[PDB]
A paper describes a structure:
To address this, here we describe the design, characterization, and application of small-molecule:peptide ternary complexes in aqueous solution. This uses α-helical barrel (αHB) peptide assemblies, which comprise 5 or more α helices arranged around central channels. The αHBs present interesting de novo scaffolds because of their stability, controllable oligomeric states and lumen sizes, robustness to mutation, and the potential to functionalize the internal channels for small-molecule binding and catalysis by incorporating both proteinogenic and noncanonical amino acids. We have demonstrated the ability of the lumens of de novo designed α-helical barrel assemblies (αHBs) to bind and organize two ligands in conformations that accelerate the time scales for two different photoinduced chemical processes.
Numbering used by the authors:
A (entry chain A), B (entry chain B), C (entry chain A), D (entry chain B), E (entry chain A), F (entry chain B), ...: 102 to 131
The structure:
């Protein structure tokens, strides 16, 4: 579905945001 | 349904955001 | 409902995020 | 309705996010 | 509307989050 | 419509979140 | 569309939030 | 569709949020 | 709700259609 | 919910349409 | 809203269907 | 689901309408 | 709106159906 | 999904309406 | 969009219903 | 899409109904 695929793109973008926060955790620990 | 499955994918991505913030908290605590 | 339950899963994930921010508040105070 | 009730649950979860950020602000102020 | 009012509750919660970030700005400046 | 008006209210609230983050950036710069 | 335009306003607000985070990155580097 | 296109715009904006957080992580690492 | 009231207007119109069919039943019997 | 209640009102109106058609069938049979 | 206005247009069209069926009933009665 | 069950009630009402048309077919044949 | 315009097309088609029933009323009277 | 399954149930009911009208046509032809 | 395109398909089908009723009116007139 | 395909199934069923009305026009003319 068109709308379902677009909603899945938001989840993929939020996963990108979660990965960036893991880098900040690596930055604080470093 | 694909719509509810896509909405569930956003919730799973937000959970990964919560996991990365817990890694940040441990990085500040250490 | 299928869609309603999926939306509730997002709220549960946001609650997880709020709990992680409370750990960061505990980390800054510590 | 279950849909509007589920949407209300997201708003309640975001309010808890605002509460945790106020705890962070007090942690920086102290 | 039921759904419209629930969506407005999310906006009110996000406004609460924005106010909490203003406290963090006051905390960093202090 | 009330639905689109409610969605517009979320966008206005997110804009206030962006404003508070700009206040944080100025607090770090000062 | 009325609803589509309101959803686009949320994306524009999130882009504003992303720009504010870039200022915080400039603040930390400075 | 304009609705799915608008939802895609939110995902693109969240991706820019992830990019700005990666810039923050590099600012802490440097 | 705006949308709910408009949907109720369709049901009222269908009830008008059902009443017209009752007149046709009266016309055939007469 | 008001939306599902409004959709239920359409189903009730269509049932009245079925009742009027049964009155027509009895008018032809008599 | 344009959506509720469009739904209202369907109800108005169904009302015209009820009007034409009342004209049929008068045609059988005469 | 609340909305899904209400939509199923419309299908059940349309099935009632189809059964009434079968009576009219029995009335014409009789 | 794309969806609103498509819904309006259904109302226009129902108006066409109502006009055809007026011809049947003219046919029975003739 | 339950929503699409419910919409499919309406289409199945409308098909039964078409079947009953074909029985009417055979009743007029005989 | 596929949703609005599907809604347009219903309007096209209802137009064919209006065409068949005009054929009925000509069958009664002849 | 799941929902779009289900909506298209309704249009196909309405086309079946329009074809049945053409048989009734053939029945009246015959």
């Amino acid at each position: 579905g068109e709308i379902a695929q677009a909603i899945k793109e938001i989840a993929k973008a939020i996963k990108e945001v979660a990965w960036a926060f893991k880098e900040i955790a690596q930055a604080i620990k470093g």
